[PDB]
Amino acid sequence: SQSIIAYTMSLGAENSVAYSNNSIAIPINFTISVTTEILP
Amino acid sequence: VTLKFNGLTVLPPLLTDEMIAQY
Numbered sequence: 001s002q003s004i005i006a007y008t009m010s011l012g013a014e015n016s017v018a019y020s021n022n023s024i025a026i027p028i029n030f031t032i033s034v035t036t037e038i039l040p
Numbered sequence: 041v042t043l044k045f046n047g048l049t050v051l052p053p054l055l056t057d058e059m060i061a062q063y
């Protein structure tokens with residue numbers, strides 16, 4: 001059932017933002033995220 | 041910003057001037 005397909009590239013999730021003059025968000029938990037970056 | 045025969049082609053960018061505006 002497989003095939004090769006062509007499409008417009010999704011630049012990201014269409015993400016909605018909870019703005020208000022009186023609203024906020026602040027975090028309570030976090031990842032100490034490790035990344036590799038590699039250079040000649 | 042103002043702007044053929046002998047084997048010469050100007051290929052398109054991967055990202056259109058419109059998708060630049062999306063990012």
Ligand SMILES: *[C@@H]1O[C@H](CO)[C@@H](O)[C@H](O)[C@H]1NC(C)=O
Nearest residue numbers: 017018019020021022023024
């Ligand atoms: C905050 O926004 C609401 C509309 O969403 C408005 O009625 C309210 O007066 C605003 N408050 C302040 C302090 O700007």
